[PDB]
Amino acid sequence: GLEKIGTWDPASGLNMTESLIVTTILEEPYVLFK
């Protein structure tokens, strides 16, 4: 049915009460430190 969920009041606003790792090795020219 219709149940409350939160309160408005124009000062405080709307208090809404809802609750890949890839390994390699270094060998030229396969993989090099850039």
PDB file of N, CA, C and O in Angstrom:
ATOM      1  N   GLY A   1       0.801  -1.199   0.000  1.00  0.00           N
ATOM      2  CA  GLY A   1       0.000   0.000   0.000  1.00  0.00           C
ATOM      3  C   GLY A   1       0.837   1.255   0.000  1.00  0.00           C
ATOM      4  O   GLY A   1       2.009   1.236  -0.381  1.00  0.00           O
ATOM      5  N   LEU A   2       0.242   2.354   0.428  1.00  0.00           N
ATOM      6  CA  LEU A   2       0.919   3.636   0.448  1.00  0.00           C
ATOM      7  C   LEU A   2       1.596   3.816   1.793  1.00  0.00           C
ATOM      8  O   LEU A   2       0.925   3.983   2.813  1.00  0.00           O
ATOM      9  N   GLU A   3       2.917   3.793   1.791  1.00  0.00           N
ATOM     10  CA  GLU A   3       3.688   3.929   3.012  1.00  0.00           C
ATOM     11  C   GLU A   3       4.667   5.073   2.856  1.00  0.00           C
ATOM     12  O   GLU A   3       5.124   5.361   1.750  1.00  0.00           O
ATOM     13  N   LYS A   4       4.974   5.737   3.963  1.00  0.00           N
ATOM     14  CA  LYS A   4       5.889   6.860   3.904  1.00  0.00           C
ATOM     15  C   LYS A   4       7.297   6.353   3.664  1.00  0.00           C
ATOM     16  O   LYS A   4       7.614   5.200   3.953  1.00  0.00           O
ATOM     17  N   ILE A   5       8.130   7.191   3.058  1.00  0.00           N
ATOM     18  CA  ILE A   5       9.512   6.792   2.842  1.00  0.00           C
ATOM     19  C   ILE A   5      10.468   7.887   3.280  1.00  0.00           C
ATOM     20  O   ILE A   5      11.669   7.643   3.406  1.00  0.00           O
ATOM     21  N   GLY A   6       9.968   9.079   3.535  1.00  0.00           N
ATOM     22  CA  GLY A   6      10.845  10.175   3.900  1.00  0.00           C
ATOM     23  C   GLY A   6      10.078  11.471   3.994  1.00  0.00           C
ATOM     24  O   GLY A   6       8.959  11.596   3.517  1.00  0.00           O
ATOM     25  N   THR A   7      10.703  12.451   4.633  1.00  0.00           N
ATOM     26  CA  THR A   7      10.018  13.686   4.979  1.00  0.00           C
ATOM     27  C   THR A   7      10.630  14.858   4.240  1.00  0.00           C
ATOM     28  O   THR A   7      11.853  14.957   4.127  1.00  0.00           O
ATOM     29  N   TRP A   8       9.781  15.746   3.756  1.00  0.00           N
ATOM     30  CA  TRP A   8      10.207  17.048   3.287  1.00  0.00           C
ATOM     31  C   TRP A   8       9.926  18.079   4.362  1.00  0.00           C
ATOM     32  O   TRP A   8       8.936  17.987   5.088  1.00  0.00           O
ATOM     33  N   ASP A   9      10.794  19.081   4.442  1.00  0.00           N
ATOM     34  CA  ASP A   9      10.427  20.339   5.075  1.00  0.00           C
ATOM     35  C   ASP A   9      11.272  21.381   4.381  1.00  0.00           C
ATOM     36  O   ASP A   9      12.436  21.093   4.093  1.00  0.00           O
ATOM     37  N   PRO A  10      10.751  22.579   4.099  1.00  0.00           N
ATOM     38  CA  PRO A  10      11.411  23.462   3.133  1.00  0.00           C
ATOM     39  C   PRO A  10      12.746  24.016   3.587  1.00  0.00           C
ATOM     40  O   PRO A  10      13.514  24.482   2.739  1.00  0.00           O
ATOM     41  N   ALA A  11      13.065  23.965   4.876  1.00  0.00           N
ATOM     42  CA  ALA A  11      14.413  24.315   5.301  1.00  0.00           C
ATOM     43  C   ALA A  11      15.377  23.171   5.035  1.00  0.00           C
ATOM     44  O   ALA A  11      16.329  23.311   4.266  1.00  0.00           O
ATOM     45  N   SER A  12      15.128  22.018   5.638  1.00  0.00           N
ATOM     46  CA  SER A  12      16.059  20.905   5.602  1.00  0.00           C
ATOM     47  C   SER A  12      15.926  20.041   4.362  1.00  0.00           C
ATOM     48  O   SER A  12      16.547  18.980   4.299  1.00  0.00           O
ATOM     49  N   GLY A  13      15.143  20.455   3.387  1.00  0.00           N
ATOM     50  CA  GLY A  13      15.108  19.721   2.141  1.00  0.00           C
ATOM     51  C   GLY A  13      14.313  18.442   2.255  1.00  0.00           C
ATOM     52  O   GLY A  13      13.180  18.423   2.753  1.00  0.00           O
ATOM     53  N   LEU A  14      14.923  17.353   1.794  1.00  0.00           N
ATOM     54  CA  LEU A  14      14.248  16.082   1.551  1.00  0.00           C
ATOM     55  C   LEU A  14      15.012  14.975   2.262  1.00  0.00           C
ATOM     56  O   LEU A  14      15.880  14.339   1.666  1.00  0.00           O
ATOM     57  N   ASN A  15      14.696  14.741   3.527  1.00  0.00           N
ATOM     58  CA  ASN A  15      15.327  13.667   4.284  1.00  0.00           C
ATOM     59  C   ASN A  15      14.638  12.380   3.876  1.00  0.00           C
ATOM     60  O   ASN A  15      13.593  12.027   4.415  1.00  0.00           O
ATOM     61  N   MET A  16      15.198  11.690   2.893  1.00  0.00           N
ATOM     62  CA  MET A  16      14.557  10.508   2.324  1.00  0.00           C
ATOM     63  C   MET A  16      15.086   9.273   3.036  1.00  0.00           C
ATOM     64  O   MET A  16      16.220   8.848   2.826  1.00  0.00           O
ATOM     65  N   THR A  17      14.247   8.676   3.879  1.00  0.00           N
ATOM     66  CA  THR A  17      14.664   7.574   4.744  1.00  0.00           C
ATOM     67  C   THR A  17      14.502   6.264   4.000  1.00  0.00           C
ATOM     68  O   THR A  17      13.646   5.445   4.325  1.00  0.00           O
ATOM     69  N   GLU A  18      15.338   6.051   2.991  1.00  0.00           N
ATOM     70  CA  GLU A  18      15.381   4.766   2.315  1.00  0.00           C
ATOM     71  C   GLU A  18      16.635   4.028   2.759  1.00  0.00           C
ATOM     72  O   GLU A  18      17.712   4.618   2.880  1.00  0.00           O
ATOM     73  N   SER A  19      16.471   2.737   3.031  1.00  0.00           N
ATOM     74  CA  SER A  19      17.568   1.891   3.493  1.00  0.00           C
ATOM     75  C   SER A  19      17.260   0.420   3.247  1.00  0.00           C
ATOM     76  O   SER A  19      16.124   0.057   2.951  1.00  0.00           O
ATOM     77  N   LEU A  20      43.910  -7.686 -16.632  1.00  0.00           N
ATOM     78  CA  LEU A  20      44.522  -8.969 -16.339  1.00  0.00           C
ATOM     79  C   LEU A  20      45.999  -8.792 -16.093  1.00  0.00           C
ATOM     80  O   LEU A  20      46.663  -8.036 -16.793  1.00  0.00           O
ATOM     81  N   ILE A  21      46.514  -9.488 -15.089  1.00  0.00           N
ATOM     82  CA  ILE A  21      47.938  -9.433 -14.797  1.00  0.00           C
ATOM     83  C   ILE A  21      48.677 -10.284 -15.819  1.00  0.00           C
ATOM     84  O   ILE A  21      48.476 -11.505 -15.902  1.00  0.00           O
ATOM     85  N   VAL A  22      49.524  -9.647 -16.617  1.00  0.00           N
ATOM     86  CA  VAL A  22      50.287 -10.335 -17.651  1.00  0.00           C
ATOM     87  C   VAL A  22      51.758 -10.212 -17.325  1.00  0.00           C
ATOM     88  O   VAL A  22      52.308  -9.109 -17.237  1.00  0.00           O
ATOM     89  N   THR A  23      52.395 -11.348 -17.156  1.00  0.00           N
ATOM     90  CA  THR A  23      53.808 -11.382 -16.863  1.00  0.00           C
ATOM     91  C   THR A  23      54.588 -11.477 -18.161  1.00  0.00           C
ATOM     92  O   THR A  23      54.089 -11.974 -19.185  1.00  0.00           O
ATOM     93  N   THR A  24      55.809 -10.959 -18.113  1.00  0.00           N
ATOM     94  CA  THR A  24      56.735 -11.143 -19.220  1.00  0.00           C
ATOM     95  C   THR A  24      58.152 -11.142 -18.685  1.00  0.00           C
ATOM     96  O   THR A  24      58.382 -11.046 -17.482  1.00  0.00           O
ATOM     97  N   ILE A  25      59.102 -11.250 -19.598  1.00  0.00           N
ATOM     98  CA  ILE A  25      60.512 -11.075 -19.285  1.00  0.00           C
ATOM     99  C   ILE A  25      61.079 -10.058 -20.253  1.00  0.00           C
ATOM    100  O   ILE A  25      60.418  -9.641 -21.209  1.00  0.00           O
ATOM    101  N   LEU A  26      62.307  -9.646 -19.997  1.00  0.00           N
ATOM    102  CA  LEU A  26      62.947  -8.667 -20.858  1.00  0.00           C
ATOM    103  C   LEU A  26      63.990  -9.368 -21.709  1.00  0.00           C
ATOM    104  O   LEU A  26      64.939  -9.945 -21.180  1.00  0.00           O
ATOM    105  N   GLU A  27      63.810  -9.338 -23.024  1.00  0.00           N
ATOM    106  CA  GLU A  27      64.807  -9.857 -23.952  1.00  0.00           C
ATOM    107  C   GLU A  27      64.621  -9.147 -25.275  1.00  0.00           C
ATOM    108  O   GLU A  27      63.520  -9.132 -25.827  1.00  0.00           O
ATOM    109  N   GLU A  28      65.681  -8.547 -25.767  1.00  0.00           N
ATOM    110  CA  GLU A  28      65.573  -7.789 -26.992  1.00  0.00           C
ATOM    111  C   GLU A  28      65.544  -8.742 -28.178  1.00  0.00           C
ATOM    112  O   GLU A  28      66.355  -9.661 -28.248  1.00  0.00           O
ATOM    113  N   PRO A  29      64.636  -8.543 -29.131  1.00  0.00           N
ATOM    114  CA  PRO A  29      63.710  -7.422 -29.146  1.00  0.00           C
ATOM    115  C   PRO A  29      62.341  -7.833 -28.736  1.00  0.00           C
ATOM    116  O   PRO A  29      61.412  -7.176 -29.172  1.00  0.00           O
ATOM    117  N   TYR A  30      62.203  -8.899 -27.956  1.00  0.00           N
ATOM    118  CA  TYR A  30      60.871  -9.421 -27.681  1.00  0.00           C
ATOM    119  C   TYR A  30      60.079  -8.453 -26.814  1.00  0.00           C
ATOM    120  O   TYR A  30      59.022  -7.965 -27.219  1.00  0.00           O
ATOM    121  N   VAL A  31      60.610  -8.104 -25.649  1.00  0.00           N
ATOM    122  CA  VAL A  31      59.982  -7.123 -24.773  1.00  0.00           C
ATOM    123  C   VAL A  31      61.086  -6.312 -24.123  1.00  0.00           C
ATOM    124  O   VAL A  31      61.948  -6.873 -23.441  1.00  0.00           O
ATOM    125  N   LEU A  32      61.060  -4.999 -24.324  1.00  0.00           N
ATOM    126  CA  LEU A  32      62.162  -4.150 -23.908  1.00  0.00           C
ATOM    127  C   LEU A  32      61.648  -3.060 -22.989  1.00  0.00           C
ATOM    128  O   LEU A  32      60.510  -2.612 -23.113  1.00  0.00           O
ATOM    129  N   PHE A  33      62.504  -2.638 -22.058  1.00  0.00           N
ATOM    130  CA  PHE A  33      62.199  -1.493 -21.211  1.00  0.00           C
ATOM    131  C   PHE A  33      62.189  -0.248 -22.074  1.00  0.00           C
ATOM    132  O   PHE A  33      63.207   0.104 -22.673  1.00  0.00           O
ATOM    133  N   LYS A  34      61.033   0.412 -22.148  1.00  0.00           N
ATOM    134  CA  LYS A  34      60.772   1.421 -23.175  1.00  0.00           C
ATOM    135  C   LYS A  34      61.597   2.664 -22.869  1.00  0.00           C
ATOM    136  O   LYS A  34      61.113   3.662 -22.336  1.00  0.00           O
TER     137      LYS A  34
END
